[PDB]
């Protein structure tokens, strides 16, 4: 269990309390979508996506089970699927539950030609910067990623900590919904 | 979704935040038991029990699926089962998810001879006063009750509100564990 954040204002603590309280009541994809819209309206980004996947023995996604696009541009998602970017996207190689991953840091490390190509294309599409939070369950070999695109989220330490703490509850909700 | 309490101190808000955060990480009966011990240590009672049941069309328990005794006296539980009190205990007739139920208020209304007998015996066993919180899921026709025996819990408005808000998350955890 990841520890709750220190240093939140009373308003931020209350927001996080409401978020986790609400998350625990989510039963349907309708509700899950509506909740993520609510969370979205609180972050310095307009681009959010949640995905559920089956994991390998190193807690990496080996099969995407469910993708809930909240506000990624549909044309980017179409391209991602059409050009099979799942195979080259460094973000899909994260070891889930190992902490928040800043995209720029991860992208700057990419070695392969195909990965560099993807990064170039993501960058052109406004997806060059962002953060991915994650949670994983041993119970059933399943994990979730919550991705938010943009530079500003990562620069708000409080928001990062809040979203990170919310992520395992979004994971439980996503399992219920699936 | 039941609303979060108003009027909690910052310490109480933090306790509730920790409780719901922890509850969302519970996967095993071991963990569920340990968590309830933790919650117990914060309330003016020493007697707590959680139960999961299948519900009728009025959200009442029709079949007990799982009983997690945290600190009810084992001799009382033995008697309850041996004398088939489940059939006469006014608390098992609550409409789950309809708000916290104070036992003394409910007991004072009992009409039947068998119910009065039960109440008399419960009272002799230190179980005459208490509160039961509840949650119900339409998804799978299942509900949970969280019972705490004693007079003092009910007299702490903050604790009541906190435990009430925790209850739906304990319900989700209990379903996962079952
Ligand atoms: C169709 C499923 C797409 C899932 C993408 C999940 C990981 C992620 O958010 N990748 C970022 C990394 C840069 O561009 C992206 O789309
Ligand atoms: C063996 C299962 C017993 C479940 C009892 C759940 C309801 C409850 O807490 N009843 C209180 C009411 C007074 O005495 C009791 O035991």
Q: In this structure, what token pair is assigned to residue B28?
A: 């095993």
Token pair 């304990």 is found at B170
Q: Find out whether B55 and B96 touch, Cβ atoms under 8 Å.
A: yes
Instruction: Please answer yes or no on whether B24 and A165 come within 8 Å at the CB atom.
Output: no
Report H helices in chain B. 10-23, 29-40, 74-82, 103-107, 113-124, 157-177
Closest CA to A21 of B18, B115, B96, B52: B18
Strand order in the sheet with A101-102: A61-69, A47-55, A142-149, A130-137, A101-102
Experimental approach: X-ray
Contacts for A107 with CB less than 8 Å, ≥ 6 apart = A90, A119, A122, A128
Q: Find out whether B49 and B59 touch, Cβ atoms under 8 Å.
A: no
User: How many other C-beta atoms are found inside a 10 Å radius of the C-beta of residue B168?
Assistant: 23
Pick from B6, B10, B24 the residue to mutate for testing the A interface (most A CBs within 10 Å): B24
B24/A contact by beta carbon, under 8 A: yes
Contacts for B166 with CB less than 8 Å, ≥ 6 apart = B16, B19, B20, B23, B39, B133, B146
Q: Find out whether B51 and B148 touch, Cβ atoms under 8 Å.
A: no
Ligand number, closest to the Cα atom of B128:
2
Q: Find out whether B93 and B87 touch, Cβ atoms under 8 Å.
A: no
Q: Find out whether A110 and A90 touch, Cβ atoms under 8 Å.
A: yes
Question: Residue B27 is nearest to which of A18, A21, A139, comparing CB atoms?
Answer: A139
Token pair 């699936």 is found at A178
Q: Find out whether B35 and B26 touch, Cβ atoms under 8 Å.
A: yes
Question: Residue B24 is nearest to which of A14, A17, A24, comparing CB atoms?
Answer: A24
Walk me through the domains of chain B, giving residue ranges and CATH numbers: 1-178 (3.30.450.80)
SS3 state at A43: coil
CA distance A160 to B13: 21
CA distance B134 to B163: 10
Report resolution (Å) to 1 decimal.
Answer: 1.6
Pocket of ligand 1 (CB under 6 A): A 49, 51, 67, 77, 80-81, 89, 91-92, 103, 122, 127, 132, 147
Give me the residues paired with residue A38 across strands. none
CA distance A134 to B11: 28
From ligand 2's centre to the CA of B89, what distance in Å? 7
Token pair 């139920």 is found at B101
């Amino acid at each position: 269990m990841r520890p709750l954040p220190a240093g939140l204002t009373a308003s931020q603590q209350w927001t996080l309390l409401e978020w986790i309280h609400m998350a625990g009541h989510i039963e349907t994809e309708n509700e899950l979508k509506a909740f993520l819209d609510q969370v979205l309206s609180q972050a310095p980004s307009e681009r959010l996506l949640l995905a559920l996947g089956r994991l390998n023995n190193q807690n990496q996604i080996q099969r995407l089970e469910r993708v809930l696009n909240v506000s990624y541009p549909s044309d980017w998602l179409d391209q991602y699927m059409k050009e099979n970017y799942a195979q080259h996207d460094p973000i899909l190689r994260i070891h889930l539950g190992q902490g928040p991953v800043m995209w720029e840091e991860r992208f700057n490390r990419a070695k392969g030609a195909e990965e560099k190509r993807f990064i170039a294309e993501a960058t052109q599409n406004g997806m060059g910067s962002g953060i991915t939070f994650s949670a994983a369950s041993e119970r059933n070999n399943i994990g979730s990623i919550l991705s938010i695109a943009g530079r500003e989220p990562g620069r708000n330490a409080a928001l990062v900590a809040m979203l990170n703490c919310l992520t395992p509850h979004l994971h439980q909700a996503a399992i219920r919904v699936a």
